[PDB]
């Protein structure tokens, strides 16, 4: 997550 947290990375597009």
């Amino acid at each position, epitope marked *: 997550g947290x990375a*597009g």
Partner: antibody
Amino acid sequence: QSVEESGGRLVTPGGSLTLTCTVSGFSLSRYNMGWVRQAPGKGLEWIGWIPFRGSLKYATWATGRFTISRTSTTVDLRMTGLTAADTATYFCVRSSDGFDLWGPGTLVTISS
Amino acid sequence: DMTQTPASVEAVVGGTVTIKCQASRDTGDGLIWYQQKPGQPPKRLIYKASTVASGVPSRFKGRGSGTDFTLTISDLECADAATYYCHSNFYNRWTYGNAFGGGTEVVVKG
């Protein structure tokens, strides 16, 4: 569910201080966490983010002087080399599509 | 980094404002808005750029994607007077000096 910080106090210039975040109502193994600070009258400043798995991430200014770690029940923020520029309210946060839970904050004061 | 404009905006009760958040690097829908009243911790308003958090009224309308976002507050109430912050959570893609914008103060004119 909620989070709460502890450990804020007056710190002598150049000194070190560890803050602790204690959680209630959820599991630290299933949630990311972070730290934010706010100097009086200024904006929110992200400090870092400890995901429930993977690498820690830090603001570029915090790297090398501040570290974040976990236990099964707490997360901490270990600060070194504190100066009056670090005087602020420090918040721990639960992170889950953004900071959904904030502590009341704990105050770190370096006296000039 | 994250740039919010205006720094402050004043609007009448019942009115509408749109405030802006610009990311220098693409942050997808990884964008959160918070409301902070002086002397209180922030409250998460909107996550995933446009999803209102539970209990938040629908007159808080987050929009945008990528590098440009807006928050529109309509039917302004005195209770909406606060500073609003945007926040990028792309920690596994970008480094940050600050993941938050600088804040927009909203002054409600009675």
